[PDB]
């Protein structure tokens, strides 16, 4: 996956007008948008098609898929029907649940991203201790795309080590949660950035500034 400026916008605004306006303001800096449940549950799955129509951007559906295999299959089918290019799936529920998603993605010409360790403090309670094993499970299953935490660069580096340089790794927690753009890109192919851009006084300037700070990495 070729992400412009190694920067993925996490569009978690919850009304269509603001989401479209802000995305439009930063469109020159990106070609990949992560759309999650905050926007989808507020404005409907049709918002994915609207983004493709307006911006011609790649769409990653950040749905943290975390159900049994049968339900995971249905969620992936509905998601890809809406035009998502990729979907993010939790590794915690195990191999069968991930495989169900991989199967649908293969059938519809899409990608699965496996979320290993999460970026927030609560991740330390249960997920962190399983995260290396979840990553190895991804490798065993032939997963090529992964998500890991900007807020813990040593854990992000370990995830990169497990999955290899050939795998694709994206990383949230940059900015608002305390992760540094440039340090994160030592290990991740692309950074995910939400609030630092979409809550900024001037989202375009915010995006431009982040990119300026990683200029030598592009």
Ligand X SMILES: O=c1cc(O)n([C@@H]2O[C@H](COP(=O)(O)O)[C@@H](O)[C@H]2O)c(=O)[nH]1
Q: Which residues are catalytic?
A: 64
In 3D space, the residue among 105, 104, 83, 111 whose CA is nearest the CA of residue 170 turns out to be: 111
The answer to whether 146 and 134 are in contact (CB under 8 A) is: no
Q: Which does 192 bind (CB under 5 to 8 A by kind): its own copies, ligand X, none?
A: ligand X
- Here the tokens at position 143 are 């997963």
Query: Site for ligand X (CB under 6 A): how many residues?
Result: 23
At residue 171, the 3 state secondary structure works out as strand
Is residue 210 involved in binding ligand X (CB under 6 A)?
no
- Here the tokens at position 186 are 């030592």
Name which position in 14, 49, 139, 204 contacts its own copies (CB under 8 A). Answer: 14
The answer to whether 147 and 169 are in contact (CB under 8 A) is: yes
- Name the one range near ligand X by CB under 6 A: 52-60, 66-74, 155-163, 201-209: 66-74
- Name the one range near ligand X by CB under 6 A: 97-105, 111-119, 129-137, 209-217: 111-119
Query: Site for its own copies (CB under 8 A): how many residues?
Result: 50
- Here the tokens at position 73 are 């299959």
- Here the tokens at position 86 are 């990729």
Q: Which residues bind ligand X (CB under 6 A)?
A: 10, 12, 36, 62, 67-68, 71, 115, 118-119, 147, 149, 172-177, 192-196
């Amino acid at each position: 996956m070729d992400v412009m400026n190694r920067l993925i916008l996490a569009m978690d605004l919850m009304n269509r007008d603001d989401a479209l306006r802000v995305t439009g303001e930063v469109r020159e800096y990106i070609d990949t948008v992560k759309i999650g449940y905050p926007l989808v549950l507020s404005e409907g799955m049709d918002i994915i098609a609207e983004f493709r129509k307006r911006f011609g951007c790649r769409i990653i559906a950040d749905f943290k898929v975390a159900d049994i295999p049968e339900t995971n299959e249905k969620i992936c089918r509905a998601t890809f029907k809406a035009g998502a290019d990729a979907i993010i799936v939790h590794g915690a529920p195990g191999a069968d649940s991930v495989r169900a998603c991989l199967n649908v993605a293969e059938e519809m010409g899409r990608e699965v991203f496996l979320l290993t360790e999460m970026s927030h403090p609560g991740a330390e309670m249960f997920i962190q201790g399983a995260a290396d094993e979840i990553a190895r499970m991804g490798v065993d299953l032939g997963v090529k795309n992964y998500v890991g935490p900007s807020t813990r660069p040593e854990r992000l580096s370990r995830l990169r080590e497990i999955i290899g340089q050939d795998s694709f790794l994206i990383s949230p927690g940059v900015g608002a949660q305390g992760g540094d753009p440039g340090e994160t890109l030592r290990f991740a192919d692309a950074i995910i950035v939400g609030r630092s851009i979409y809550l900024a006084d001037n989202p375009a300037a915010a995006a431009a500034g982040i990119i300026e700070s990683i200029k030598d990495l592009l």
